[PDB]
UniProtKB/Swiss-Prot annotation:
Active-site residues, record numbering mapped to chain: 142
Family statement drawn from the similarity comment of this UniProt entry: Belongs to the protein kinase superfamily. Tyr protein kinase family. Fibroblast growth factor receptor subfamily.
Top-level taxon: Eukaryota
Subcellular locations according to the entry: Cell membrane; Endosome; Endoplasmic reticulum
Modification Phosphotyrosine, positions: 172-173
Phenotypic consequence of residue 47 to R: Loss of kinase activity
Subunit structure: Monomer. Homodimer after ligand binding. Interacts with FGF1, FGF2, FGF4, FGF6, FGF8, FGF9, FGF16, FGF17, FGF18, FGF19, FGF21 and FGF23 (in vitro). Binding affinity for FGF family members is enhanced by interactions between FGFs and heparan sulfate proteoglycans. Interacts with KLB; this strongly increases the affinity for FGF19 and FGF23. Affinity for FGF19 is strongly increased by KLB and sulfated glycosaminoglycans.
Record function comment: Tyrosine-protein kinase that acts as a cell-surface receptor for fibroblast growth factors and plays a role in the regulation of cell proliferation, differentiation and migration, and in regulation of lipid metabolism, bile acid biosynthesis, glucose uptake, vitamin D metabolism and phosphate homeostasis. Required for normal down-regulation of the expression of CYP7A1, the rate-limiting enzyme in bile acid synthesis, in response to FGF19. Phosphorylates PLCG1 and FRS2. Ligand binding leads to the activation of several signaling cascades.
Cytoplasmic side: 1-282
Disease implication from the record: FGFR4 variants may be involved in the pathogenesis of various cancers. It has been found in prostate cancer as well as cancers of the breast, colon, head and neck, larynx, lung, skin.
Record domain Protein kinase: where: 14-282
Annotated residues for binding of ATP: 20-25, 47
Organism field: Homo sapiens
Record's protein name: Fibroblast growth factor receptor 4
Range within the parent protein: 454 to 752 of 802
């Protein structure tokens, strides 16, 4: 691994703490991330290879690191802070979102702590982050509330947008250990035709909107993958959730248009959601 002085950070300025999830991501304290405050601590997330990882695992982490370098900075994504590539294991140092992922954030606050304008703000922020990623020609391919993280200040940050994804060997029946069926976030053109565009991410955003306004509900409730296939071929769409205004369910159904070109763009979604925010009563 060649030395990139612009991004390299001394590994001895890291103190590794508790795993956030399993390569694997660990919470850590970094000293002097701000060069002007060399002895000041900050809390970061460190991604690293699992034990006994393959060379493909290494290639994948390197790939993500390089994507992160090129993506640039935005308020509503998880940003690259630094890397450790020399004389030791590969570390990719990322921003740490104190309150965890948006799905769990929502489920833990069911009534209540969550008001309509703050829910719309969550959606608006995700749309802003996705607008940015699109402008950098980044397709996420698994946009979901589980891959949006929440800061101490309730800022939404899109995560895992730079993952090396094996789109040509997706296990559609795959259920995660938390019980998630990721196929339920895939646009039909991606699932059926293996076509991904920014408009397939817009479909996924529609599903994410439904997650937000169900306070972390699981999509297509009670429907297993075999049935989801046939339902999608028949044009099935989720029902309007309880306590969800027609403006928001309207946006969901637009995000789920059969024709990718007839879905809103992220720019249009940002504008639509801004309008709902400005209509909030004072």
């Amino acid at each position: 691994l060649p030395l990139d002085p612009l991004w390299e950070f001394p590994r001895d300025r890291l103190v590794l703490g508790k795993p956030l999830g399993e390569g694997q991501v660990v919470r850590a304290e970094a000293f002097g991330m701000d060069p002007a405050r060399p002895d000041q601590a900050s809390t970061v997330a460190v991604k690293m290879l699992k034990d006994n990882a393959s060379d493909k695992d290494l290639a994948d982490l390197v790939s993500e690191m390089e994507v992160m370098k090129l993506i640039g900075r935005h308020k509503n994504i998880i940003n690259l802070l630094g890397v450790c590539t020399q004389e030791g294991p590969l570390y990719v140092i990322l921003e740490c979102a104190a309150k965890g992922n948006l799905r769990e954030f929502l489920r833990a606050r069911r009534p209540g702590p969550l008001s309509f304008p703050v829910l719309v703000s969550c959606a608006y922020q995700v749309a802003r982050g996705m607008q940015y990623l699109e402008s950098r020609k980044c397709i996420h391919r698994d946009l979901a509330a589980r891959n949006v993280l929440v800061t101490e200040d309730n800022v939404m940050k899109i995560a895992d947008f730079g993952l090396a994804r094996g789109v040509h060997h997706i296990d559609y029946y795959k259920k995660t250990s938390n019980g998630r069926l990721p196929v339920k976030w895939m646009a039909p053109e991606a699932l059926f035709d293996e076509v991904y565009t920014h408009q397939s991410d817009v479909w996924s955003f529609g599903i994410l909107l439904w997650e937000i306004f169900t306070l972390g509900g699981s999509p297509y409730p009670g429907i297993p993958v075999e049935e989801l296939f046939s339902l999608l071929r028949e044009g099935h769409r989720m029902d309007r959730p309880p306590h969800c205004p027609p403006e928001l369910y309207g946006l969901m159904r637009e995000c789920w248009h059969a024709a990718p070109s007839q879905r809103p763009t992220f720019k249009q979604l940002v504008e639509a959601l801004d309008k709902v925010l400005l209509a909030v009563s004072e």
